[PDB]
């Protein structure tokens, strides 16, 4: 109801910074939340490929 982003994955996220991987949907990160801006979203299910590529969880290798 508040998606002001265009490119895929990169969606509006108030607290950015770290994220999750295809092995750690949740990475331990203190109060290191980046300012509000379009970026990846772990709470939704986006993971960063080993190449640091923010992509849906299903967009993972085999």
UniProtKB/Swiss-Prot annotation:
Its main location: secreted. Residues 5-60 form the TIL domain. Disulfide bonds join 5-38, 15-33, 18-29, 22-60, 40-54. It is found in: Secreted. One of its GO terms (cellular component) is extracellular region. InterPro entries: Ser_inhib-like_sf, TIL_dom. Pfam families: TIL (PF01826). GO terms for molecular function: serine-type endopeptidase inhibitor activity. Keywords: Disulfide bond, Protease inhibitor, Secreted, Serine protease inhibitor. Belongs to the serine protease inhibitor-like (TIL domain-containing) family. This is Trypsin inhibitor. It comes from Ascaris suum.
């Amino acid at each position: 109801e508040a998606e002001k982003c265009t490119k895929p994955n990169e969606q509006w996220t108030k607290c950015g910074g770290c994220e999750g991987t295809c092995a750690q949907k949740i990475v331990p990160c203190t109060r290191e939340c980046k300012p509000p801006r379009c970026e990846c979203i772990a709470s939704a299910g986006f993971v960063r490929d080993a190449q640091g590529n923010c992509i849906k969880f299903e967009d993972c290798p085999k």
